[PDB]
Amino acid sequence: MAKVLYITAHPLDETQSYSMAVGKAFIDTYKEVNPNDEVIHIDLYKENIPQIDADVFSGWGKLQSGKGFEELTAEEKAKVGRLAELSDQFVAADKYVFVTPMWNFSFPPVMKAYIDSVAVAGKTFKYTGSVGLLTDKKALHIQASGGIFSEGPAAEMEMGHRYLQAIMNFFGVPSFEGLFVEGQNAMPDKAQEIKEKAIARAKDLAHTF
Amino acid sequence: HMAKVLYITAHPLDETQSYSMAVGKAFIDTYKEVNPNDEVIHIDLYKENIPQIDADVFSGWGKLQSGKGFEELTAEEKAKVGRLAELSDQFVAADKYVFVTPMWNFSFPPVMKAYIDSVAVAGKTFKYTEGSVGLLTDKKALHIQASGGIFSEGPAAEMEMGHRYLQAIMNFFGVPSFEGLFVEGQNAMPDKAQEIKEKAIARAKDLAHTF
Ligand SMILES: Cc1cc2nc3c(=O)[nH]c(=O)nc-3n(C[C@H](O)[C@H](O)[C@H](O)COP(=O)(O)O)c2cc1C
Ligand SMILES: Cc1cc2nc3c(=O)[nH]c(=O)nc-3n(C[C@H](O)[C@H](O)[C@H](O)COP(=O)(O)O)c2cc1C
């Protein structure tokens, strides 16, 4: 039945991270409710997510100019092939769950490397400006932040959800939702309640996502 | 010698193959010609070691935060925590920053975020308050960005996320002056590519006389 990419960008586990704990409650409940679904954890700190580098440009340039994958160097093939797998896996899925901590207003670097690995002309978008191809998908972003960024002055500083929002628009993903676990550092006295309330929200959302 | 300038580039290709690096290079060559005494350091984020924050960095920070000496860090914790400290100290010690990036999917290459994560350090570039305040009150910065389409202006302005992010961080750090120079349109209107670039190079040269 449906394929769901549970995409995490956190080097810590659900015992040490508010985003991972919330995500964990979400995705556990999602599998409970949808036992038939293909739920794939993409762990961006365990998988190799190649940044686009000189080898990638050179490997791509070769393929572009008619060359065979055989003709790439070992490094070019390893990076290029990995990016192709990432790309293919993303298009093949039905639903996306991104889970991130807020670091300096946005997400860990590897979340940008993941987006770069799946943003591929002819797969997630096409030139026209551009139009998105992923017109039958859905996505959720679970984001943790020390202070409050969903409301108030700080909302103009929020840049991680804002970026993923732009990308979802770019890919033509028709349904996108934010679930924020926010304010636990600005209000340490309210940290457990903030967490638990976000968990309850996540488990409810998992019953219809 | 009198000011220290960090020329921070995030491109795998060089000034002969990249619009951003071509404009960056005209800028910095000229800046050096006009300010020969300034120390200008090229930080090429594709060649340098720019560690991402990972399990080892969290662990080693944690240790340091709990009152352990650096000596109690593992070898890999020391190398990564050490390196992040070098980057952080280097950033604070400079007087001016020049960021040079291509626009990839509305923003910059992943390594640019790693470098920002490396320098965004409490007690160095900002401090907490009873929110926060920037400490880089007497620094200055410039961002040169290249994009295939136009994102500085037009209805696509709302999609721009690279410059916007660095603007947020320069605000967070208290930097009172942050300028953008865009080289844009060259892929959307390929018959205008050479003129787009030559106008941006001339602008870069011009700016280098006052930066
Ligand atoms: C490197 C770094 C940068 C951070 N930057 C921010 C920030 O810009 N804004 C914020 O509110 N909290 C920031 N925090 C606090 C975390 O966002 C917060 O502790 C949150 O719970 C992180 O998600 P996690 O608990 O899933 O790790 C940062 C923490 C670290 C290590
Ligand atoms: C991986 C990748 C992603 C890109 N994403 C964007 C984008 O969002 N917007 C855009 O106008 N161009 C995009 N481009 C095109 C580059 O911005 C364009 O080639 C531009 O001239 C980049 O600057 P450079 O010339 O310094 O590389 C992308 C190119 C690549 C390889």
Decide: helix, strand or coil at residue B107: strand
How far is it, in rounded angstroms, from Cα B20 to Cα B40?
18
How far is it, in rounded angstroms, from Cα B113 to Cα B116?
5
How far is it, in rounded angstroms, from Cα B168 to Cα A55?
32
Mutate to test the interface with B, among A12, A105, A156 (most CBs of B within 10 A): A105
Which residues have CB under 8 Å from B47's CB, separation 6+?
none
Q: With the C-alpha atoms ordered B55, B101, A47, A102, is the resulting torsion angle positive or negative?
A: positive
Strand-pair category, B4-9 with B39-44: parallel
How far is it, in rounded angstroms, from Cα B211 to Cα B205?
10
Residues with CB under 6 A from ligand 1: A 10, 17-20, 101-105, 144-147, 184-185; B 53, 117
Range(s) of the domain holding residue B96: 1-211
Total domains present in chain A: 1
What would the 3-class secondary structure string for chain A be? CCEEEEEECCCCCCCCCHHHHHHHHHHHHHHHHCCCCEEEEEECCCCCCCCCCHHHHHHHHHHHCCCCHHHCCHHHHHHHHHHHHHHHHHHHCCEEEEEEECECCECCHHHHHHHHHHCCECCCEEECCEEECCCCCEEEEEEEECCCCCCCHHHHHCCHHHHHHHHHHHHCCCCEEEEEEECCCCCHHHHHHHHHHHHHHHHHHHCCC
Decide: helix, strand or coil at residue B46: coil
* CATH of residue B96: 3.40.50.360
Report yes or no: A108 at the B interface, CB cutoff 8 Å.
yes
User: Residue A10 phi/psi, 5° resolution?
Assistant: -150, 125
Hey, what amino acid is at B45? L
A37-69 burial code (b ≥16 CB/10 A, e <16): eebeebebeebebbbbbbbbbbbbebeeeeeee
- Residue from A85, A34, A30, A129 nearest B189 by CA: A129
Contact A116 B106 (CB under 8 A): no
User: Residue B18 phi/psi, 5° resolution?
Assistant: -135, 135
Contact A170 B156 (CB under 8 A): no
Q: Are B4 and B95 in contact (CB under 8 A)?
A: yes
Report yes or no: B113 at the A interface, CB cutoff 8 Å.
yes
DSSP state of B109: -
Q: Are B179 and B192 in contact (CB under 8 A)?
A: no
Contact B104 A56 (CB under 8 A): no
Q: Are A76 and A62 in contact (CB under 8 A)?
A: yes
Determine the distance from the C-alpha atom of residue B37 to the mean position of all C-alpha atoms in its chain, rounded to a whole number. 22
How far is it, in rounded angstroms, from Cα A9 to Cα B107?
18
Q: Are B22 and B201 in contact (CB under 8 A)?
A: yes
Cross-strand partners of B179: B142
- Residue from B50, B31, B85 nearest A53 by CA: B50
Strand-pair category, B4-9 with A95-101: unpaired
Q: With the C-alpha atoms ordered B160, B166, B170, B172, is the resulting torsion angle positive or negative?
A: positive
In angstroms, this model's resolution equals 2.0
Q: Are B179 and B1 in contact (CB under 8 A)?
A: no
Mutate to test the pocket of ligand 1, among A100, A103, A142 (most ligand atoms within 8 A of CB): A103
